[PDB]
Amino acid sequence: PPNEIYATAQQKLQDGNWRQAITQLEALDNRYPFGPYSQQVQLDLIYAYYKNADLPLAQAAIDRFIRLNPTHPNIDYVMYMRGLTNMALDDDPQQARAAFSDFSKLVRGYPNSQYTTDATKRLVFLKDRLAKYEYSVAEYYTERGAWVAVVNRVEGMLRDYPDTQATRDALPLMENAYRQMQMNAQAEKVAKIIAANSSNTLEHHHHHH
């Protein structure tokens, strides 16, 4: 009785009985996969797979929802969930890169979403993680004297993760790599960047566009 099965699944989700809720929701999605309530069932299944730590199933279900309903009113929430799932898969920064992309795509689509604030919080951690990885790579390239690869990695950190501890730590690798190449205009630029990067991070959550 699909309406009572649905009400039942909703209670199971509220109890945190992920396994039973997944069962009943999958059977509904089997039976009416393009029914009037199918997007509802799929959103709840996304959630239940995530909470049950079925992360590959959550990820696949998110991708299918986005493909099939690219303009849905709850897309903001589906991309929040895609960030959470990829972030859980991270705990080889592939999953962290996917989460950064998800959440940054969320913040630049729905700057007014209820999930805004938590996505921005998670982005601080992600940017820290990804910049640390890129710093390790820049160091390795330094060890090799691969000065052009050093400059490429650091400028990517400065472009994408400008306010992180790792980009701070990596700027002198970049100034060095240019100097090693006798590239004075470039090296002096980095020296400028370093002198000016305050630990004071700027806030613009109170600005609306």
From Swiss-Prot:
It is a lipid-anchor. It holds the Pfam family YfiO. Gene3D superfamilies: Tetratricopeptide repeat domain (1.25.40.10). GO terms for biological process: Gram-negative-bacterium-type cell outer membrane assembly; protein insertion into membrane. PROSITE patterns: PROKAR_LIPOPROTEIN. Transmembrane segments: none annotated. It comes from the Bacteria. GO terms for cellular component: Bam protein complex; cell outer membrane; membrane. It is found in: Cell outer membrane. Disruption phenotype: Depletion decreases the density of outer membrane proteins, but does not significantly affect transport of lipopolysaccharides to the outer membrane. Keywords: Cell outer membrane, Lipoprotein, Membrane, Palmitate, Signal. Part of the Bam complex, which is composed of the outer membrane protein BamA, and four lipoproteins BamB, BamC, BamD and BamE. Forms a subcomplex with BamC and BamE. Interacts directly with BamA. The Bam complex has the shape of a hat, with the BamA beta-barrel crown in the outer membrane and the periplasmic brim formed by the BamA POTRA domains and the 4 lipoproteins. Part of the outer membrane protein assembly complex (Bam), which is involved in assembly and insertion of beta-barrel proteins into the outer membrane. Constitutes, with BamA, the core component of the assembly machinery. Probably involved in transient protein interactions. Efficient substrate folding and insertion into the outer membrane requires all 5 subunits. NCBIfam families: OM_YfiO (TIGR03302), PRK10866.1 (NF008119). The N-terminal may interact with various proteins as a chaperone to assist in the folding and insertion of proteins into the outer membrane. The C-terminal region may serve as the link between BamA, BamC and BamE. Belongs to the BamD family. HAMAP family: OM_assembly_BamD. This is Outer membrane protein assembly factor BamD.
